[model samples]
Target: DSNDLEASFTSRLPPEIVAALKRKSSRDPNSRFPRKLHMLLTYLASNPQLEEEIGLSWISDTEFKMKKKNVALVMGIKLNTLNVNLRDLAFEQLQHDKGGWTQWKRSGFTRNS
Candidate 1:
């Protein structure tokens, strides 16, 4: 009942991202970022306007630097761990228009990133 939904949500991620998360999970259980990834993507999906600022633009180039920068900060993770390419991969999954993210967020996978 517990890791069930989280597993399904994670299954949709790129294998590289999955492996990265797995490694992180092994080190620190408290700051896992999958659920937060889902949440951020879902937020981007609905607020498509912010997509340019948050999704595409680099944290530095964006006018709203804090908006982009704070994503990792608020998630209690670092850019070194989450990085740009991996973040792009997660955004690609969200861009695919899959209904999985909505379901995952709506259902109860809301544990803290």
Candidate 2:
């Protein structure tokens, strides 16, 4: 039953990160970046090494650039609603070691500029 897992993704993700995502999202609440944020964090938990690149690409590039292997990390359940480029999946891989994500990718969560 894929029911328990479904209870508002915004509620599932870290509160701070959720705030950042929503703020950065601006228009199009349906944007893929926020939509796939959970999955991106989960994948990052699976493969910590590529986590850095993901955040970097997230902040720098319009698209999340990563090697082929890293782009598709620890594949999980289904969650797609767009052409879904690498940037989309990049965010899902940060669910585990979210510190790095918060420091860099979480907009202005805690990282002092």
Candidate 3:
């Protein structure tokens, strides 16, 4: 865990997640990607442990991939965020992997990488 800087919220949550939010501002069109969506993405990026033992990768577009979870999120944040749709959060999850080489990385395994 000495990789303190790398493990910060910035490192965990990529910018695209927020940008995707900027694109999905339907309920609040004026926001043209409201803060709620960005806020949701912020949760995931800031709380990597919340998504521990789960696979993370880019499935396509703003859609991210969260996979392989015998249980739900590791904490309340993600569990709460579940109320928000993947489309809204700018992420996605595969019912089955089918080997998404499309993903850039993996998750739900080690807290440190």
Candidates' TM-scores? 0.31, 0.25, 0.25
Instruction: Tell me how far the alpha carbon of residue 51 in candidate 2 is from the true structure, in angstroms, after superposition.
Output: 12
Instruction: For residues 32-97, write the lDDT of model 1, one tens digit per residue.
Output: 554435545544445555543344222221111123243443343565554553444343222322
* TM-score (C-alpha) between model 2 and the true structure: 0.25
Off by over 4 Å in 3: 1-38, 53-63, 68-96, 99-113
Q: Candidate 1 regions off by >4 Å?
A: 1-31, 56-76, 84-113
Number of backbone collisions per candidate: 1, 11, 8
Model 3 vs. true fold: TM: 0.25
Which 10-residue span in candidate 2 carries the lowest summed lDDT? 103-112
Please give the lDDT score at residue 99 for candidate 2. Answer: 40
Give the per-residue lDDT digits (tens) of candidate 2, residues 6-54. Answer: 3333344456544544443445643434344444544445555445444
Residue 23's lDDT in candidate 3 = 54
Candidate of highest TM-score: 1
